[PDB]
Design a protein around this ligand. Structure first.
Ligand SMILES: *CC(=O)Nc1ccc(Cl)c(S(=O)(=O)N2CCOCC2)c1
Ligand SMILES: *CC(=O)Nc1ccc(Cl)c(S(=O)(=O)N2CCOCC2)c1
Lengths: 239, 239
């Protein structure tokens, strides 16, 4: 729908969040905000979405988050929560349904330590934007392969389908958005020496939550070409 | 005591952690490891300490933490936990006594969002090491002042003694080590336009846990001059 169109500079500040719902301030192609949206879907949390034009931001958005970044949660009480991992943790704790983080303190620390193993991967997206030719591409693929070997080791040791066990859990949703984008970045071959990680991607794409939120390669390319041309229209690609 | 002397290259791998105790692999001047040690003291957790010579590390230490970094917790069951904030969270959850993180999901997310406001400050220690003259020092003081204004705003809004309320809590211990070191780095004047932050430092130094772990300026300078000369003896300064 046009209902998903972003609010940008000059938009009216939105009204209060209705009792019984939580609001996410998101952007449809942002992988950090996708984390929060995977959790909202996986736990069956009633919510509304406000997309932000990250090239043409409303000044009122800095009242939601002084950093000016998505995702942000806002509840009916007016409380604001930001930073992707903090939003996810908050939702798992505040709402009923599937516990995505273990109750056991050690197993919960393990999920966070895996998140730490992953922590170099997002900054590699800036690396991808600065890659201009085949030489830069070869070096970019090597950087992805050395982070991916760290994740392969965890699956080798656990011999589980997923990073937190045989059931999908929080850590899987927290890293998935970057794996979702590998095909579109032409980095799919970075998982070819990481066989368990490659099977984990196939298992993720079968998860009902993942499948319900997955964006096509054509849609992510439309976004990236406008985001790279510096277009105020990038966030609204397709609408 | 000489009992605190670091284990370095060639040391024997240590034995199992006794039932009823947890072990921290630490270094006496590392502010990340100090986080974990403030939590261990604040909750009254029985523990042993193994100091690591971070200039002359035992090869067995990479079996504790593949990153080779302190702090690491090891319990009687053989479980290993690393990354400073993860160790602290784990201890607050796994042990009885003073809850340092709130039970309320929102108030817990607030502490983590403040931690995020602080997240540039530790990398400013590398900035300090690279500062060579009065011009670099002036620029370094400005960088500290812009991060400190973000923390001042939180105290202005809450009008509480501490970052999590009127009682000291986890977030205060998580940021204190860097404030402890400001005098020794000659950055004490970076809090002079942040009056609540300056009163918060005076309140911290009165906390029994903080006071019990505080290192003198003379001791931190002895460490830093050896750490800067690249000395294998830096971590054992004073012993
Ligand atoms: C919400 C959002 O998109 N945040 C964000 C911040 C930095 C980076 Cl690099 C990204 S990205 O990695 O999705 N990136 C892909 C290449 O250019 C567009 C953004 C996202
Ligand atoms: C455990 C440890 O000390 N980690 C660590 C990592 C990086 C930096 Cl920069 C520090 S520091 O900021 O304490 N630093 C002070 C100046 O030089 C010595 C180390 C600590």
């Amino acid at each position: 729908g046009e209902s998903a169109r972003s609010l940008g500079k000059g938009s009216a500040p939105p009204g209060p969040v209705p009792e019984g719902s939580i609001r996410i301030y998101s952007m449809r192609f942002c992988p950090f905000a996708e984390r929060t949206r995977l959790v909202l879907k996986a736990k069956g949390i009633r919510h509304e979405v406000i997309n932000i034009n990250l090239k043409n931001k409303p000044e009122w958005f800095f009242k939601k988050n002084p950093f000016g970044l998505v995702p942000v949660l806002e509840n009916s009480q007016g409380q604001l929560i930001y930073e992707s991992a903090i939003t996810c943790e908050y939702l798992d704790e505040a709402y009923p349904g599937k516990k995505l983080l273990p109750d056991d303190p050690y197993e919960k620390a393990c999920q966070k330590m895996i998140l730490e193993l992953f922590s170099k991967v997002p900054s590699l997206v800036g690396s991808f934007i600065r890659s201009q030719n085949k030489e830069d591409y070869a070096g970019l693929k090597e950087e992805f392969r050395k982070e991916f070997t760290k994740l392969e080791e965890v699956l080798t040791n656990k011999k589980t389908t997923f990073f937190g066990g045989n059931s999908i859990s929080m850590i899987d949703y927290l890293i998935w958005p970057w794996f979702e984008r590998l095909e579109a970045m032409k980095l799919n071959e970075c998982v070819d020496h990481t066989p368990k990680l490659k099977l984990w991607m196939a298992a993720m794409k079968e998860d009902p939550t993942v499948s319900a939120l997955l964006t096509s390669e054509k849609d992510w390319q439309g976004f990236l070409e406008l985001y790279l041309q510096n277009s105020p229209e990038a966030c609204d690609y397709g609408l």
